[PDB]
Amino acid sequence: GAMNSSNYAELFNNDIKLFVDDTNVYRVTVHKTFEGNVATKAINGCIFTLNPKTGHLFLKIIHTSVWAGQKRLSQLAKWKTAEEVSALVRSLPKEEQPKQIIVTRKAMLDPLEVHMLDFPNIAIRPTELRLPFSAAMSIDKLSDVVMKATEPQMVLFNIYDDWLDRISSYTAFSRLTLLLRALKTNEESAKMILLSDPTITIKSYHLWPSFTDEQWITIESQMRDLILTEYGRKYNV
Amino acid sequence: MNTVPFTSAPIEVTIGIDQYSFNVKENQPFHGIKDIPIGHVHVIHFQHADNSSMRYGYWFDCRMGNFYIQYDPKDGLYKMMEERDGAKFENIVHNFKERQMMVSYPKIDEDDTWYNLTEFVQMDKIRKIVRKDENQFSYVDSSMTTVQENELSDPAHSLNYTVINFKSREAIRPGHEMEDFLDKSYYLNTVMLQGIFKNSSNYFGELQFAFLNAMFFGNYGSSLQWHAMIELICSSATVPKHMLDKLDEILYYQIKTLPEQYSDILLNERVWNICLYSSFQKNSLHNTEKIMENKYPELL
């Protein structure tokens, strides 16, 4: 049914699964109109569809034109997400299709279940984990490709860079969620941590810096300290 | 007026005849029910004094045969039977009326309650929901499951109600997923009304029959069916105006007849609040909304 800390290792078994996060699909800025009313201006968004075992992130970019002339966009956005995920699944060969799709927000269950009625064997599930996938847009290369897009577009990213050569998917997912939790809690400091040292760079074909094992431990410790720091500033501890 | 004679009443039992009911004591001189209005389906139903397990009963129409009731001490229940010998049957009934062994169907002349609950119910349609084609009458009880309940187990003893499922490929056109999930008009009007029921009278007949089986037998799958059929209309933006008007009348009398004390099990809070307050038809069920607010405000 739902996903939580008791069955956390299931993410890393050999059943193909995808997380789908729709939190950056419909994005707006809110501004005042000359008449002193408020209006929104949409900006480009993305569906964050991730295989947690492999690190494959199917980043479907949502260009603002998709909203033109449409009403009830927050509701449409969930159905548009479900349509795109369903289109993605259909585009994959059968043996690459997920056996489960885990939505990060429960409002995606019905839209996705309806779009996937053709796939009665694919389980659509919620999760009780608080995953920080909304911070995907704090990753510069992903942010850049979303904001530059002039049309709908699907871009493939490996969100783990080369980490699986050296660590397990369990550890790689744990690192990713720590990095994203940090970026979600204090984006500036998180990025300061990640790029302070100019001698460690991000390869052209990567999203994150080329940290050795020892440097990753330090980075990971600094990110924990940041999350702890913000939790303190937040709650005054 | 017609008569359902009873051979005898060997066990203490509460007998219902449509919305009426009366107690018969073990071996009391009861020989049946007289003055039954012709022109309506009826239901005669039973709840044993010694074992309220299994409410059960028989739908029938007096224009389809001469029916009587006889206790079966092997199966332990009151059985409906047909008498083919017309002369034997009149002779039996007359003898029992002459000795006044029958309760009179107590229809008040101002009262259209039964008509209003059964307006669209037809025995021919009942017999396709309750499959037992060797009898002109149809047995229902408390525990019978529906065809849809068996999919989610004996198929011969099921209620074959029309399957309604809002997250099914029947209900959802490919490429209209959002539209059809949020506005069921396609499912209501093309799939169900034009496709399956042929008309709204047949749809209402099933709806009314589902309600009556829920109320009289506490049949849970019938209550699910009654609520699904209401929800399908309430959740459609485009419903012919005459269907909405008739639906309001139908539901009104159902709500009026429901025991006040059974409201907690027979009424689904989600469907009703949706129908009355959140749905396309939130402003279209005036009579139903007014009785529901005055009689069951707790549900809302």
Ligand SMILES: C[C@H](Sc1ccccn1)C(=O)O
């Ligand atoms: C292109 C690969 S990631 C990926 C994501 C989705 C589908 C295929 N591959 C890489 O950059 O290592």
